[PDB]
């Protein structure tokens, strides 16, 4: 026969290896394929769909009312309404979404994000809001004039009331590890805050408290790399 030498790597079973195997059924031909609507080709098609964020994930909260941001009439101006971190691979509102559960299978994410705010309230209740994304640096801003120095959008309540704040890609490096906390505070993305521009005005005979639904998705700049495992499932023994 031919002379040959065996090298290191012989007799190993690599998990993520691409190698052929010997078949079991000779001359087999499977069942003919039919057309089923909704064929997916990559996982970036699932990351660009809006999905309700759980911004109200605090305590003293019921099952479903964790998905709503309460808005009501104020007495002092400039008041803050809500705030949450941007990191999708971090515990918080980005964990109930779909881009947060897919970017948890991958280690390094990239690209710009998108947060859509829909106003569930009465037709006669108006108002304005200021949604401000702030890059890393100091902690959550304490005032509204501090938040206006970042990247903000002023959204009023009208016939559409479905605004969408884009979160651009402002990073030093190309990618960011989806592991934050402690020595990994170098990959934080900033804070998205929601303030009150003017107020939540409302006429008589109308409820004085409504809700905002926040949803989150990725953009066409989104990219994912280095497949890892998730930490939502746990198993002691076989089912």
Q: For residues 161-180, which are near its own copies according to CB under 8 A?
A: 174-175
First and final C-alpha spacing in the chain: 51
Question: Collapsing DSSP states into helix, strand and coil, what is residue 19?
Answer: coil
Tokens of 81: 């309404």
Q: Applying CB under 8 A, which of residues 1, 38, 63, 203 lies at the interface with its own copies?
A: 1
Stretch that binds its own copies, among 27-35, 60-68, 128-136, 202-210 (CB under 8 A): 27-35
Go through the chain and tell me how many residues it has: 239
Min CB(13)–its own copies separation in Å: 6
Cβ-based nearer residue to other proteins, 42 or 75: 42
Stretch that binds its own copies, among 22-30, 80-88, 147-155, 178-186 (CB under 8 A): 22-30
150 binds, among other proteins, its own copies, none (CB under 5 to 8 A by kind): none
The greatest distance separating any two alpha carbons of the chain, rounded to the nearest whole angstrom, comes to 96
Q: Applying CB under 8 A, which of residues 22, 139, 159, 237 lies at the interface with its own copies?
A: 22
Contacts of its own copies in 206-235 (CB under 8 A): 225-226
Burial label for 186, CB within 10 Å (0-12, 13-18, 19+), is exposed
Question: What DSSP character marks residue 145?
Answer: H
Stretch that binds its own copies, among 26-34, 53-61, 72-80, 176-184 (CB under 8 A): 26-34
Min CB(5)–its own copies separation in Å: 5
Min CB(178)–its own copies separation in Å: 16
Among the residues of 46-166, which ranges form H helices? 99-102, 144-147
Question: Collapsing DSSP states into helix, strand and coil, what is residue 83?
Answer: strand
Measure the CA–CA gap between 210 and 233, rounded to whole angstroms.
35
Q: Which residue has the tokens 């003017």?
A: 198
Report the interface residues with its own copies, using CB under 8 A.
1-11, 13-14, 16-19, 21-22, 24-26, 28, 31-32, 174-175, 225-226
């Amino acid at each position: 026969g031919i002379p040959a030498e065996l090298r290191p790597g012989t007799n190993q079973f690599l998990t993520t290896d691409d190698d052929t195997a010997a078949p079991i059924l000779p001359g087999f031909t499977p069942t003919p394929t039919i057309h089923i609507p909704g064929e997916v080709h990559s996982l970036l098609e699932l990351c660009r769909v809006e999905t309700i964020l759980e911004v109200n994930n605090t305590t003293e909260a019921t099952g479903l009312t964790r998905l709503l941001i309460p808005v009501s009439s104020q007495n002092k101006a400039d008041e803050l309404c809500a705030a949450f971190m941007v990191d999708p691979g971090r515990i918080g509102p980005w964990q109930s979404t779909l881009v947060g559960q897919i970017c948890r299978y991958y280690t390094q994410w990239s690209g710009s994000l998108k947060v859509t705010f829909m106003f569930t309230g009465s037709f006669m209740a108006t108002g304005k809001m200021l949604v401000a994304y702030s890059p890393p640096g100091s902690a959550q801003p304490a005032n509204r004039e501090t938040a206006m120095l970042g990247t903000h959008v002023i959204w009023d309540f009208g016939l559409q009331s479905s605004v969408s704040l884009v979160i651009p890609w402002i990073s030093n490096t190309h990618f960011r590890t989806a592991k934050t906390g402690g020595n990994y505070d170098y990959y934080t993305a900033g804070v998205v805050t929601l303030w009150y521009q003017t107020n939540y005005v409302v006429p008589p005979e109308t409820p004085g408290e409504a809700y905002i639904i926040a949803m989150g998705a990725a953009q066409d700049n989104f990219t994912l790399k280095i497949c890892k495992d998730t930490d939502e499932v746990t198993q002691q023994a076989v089912l």
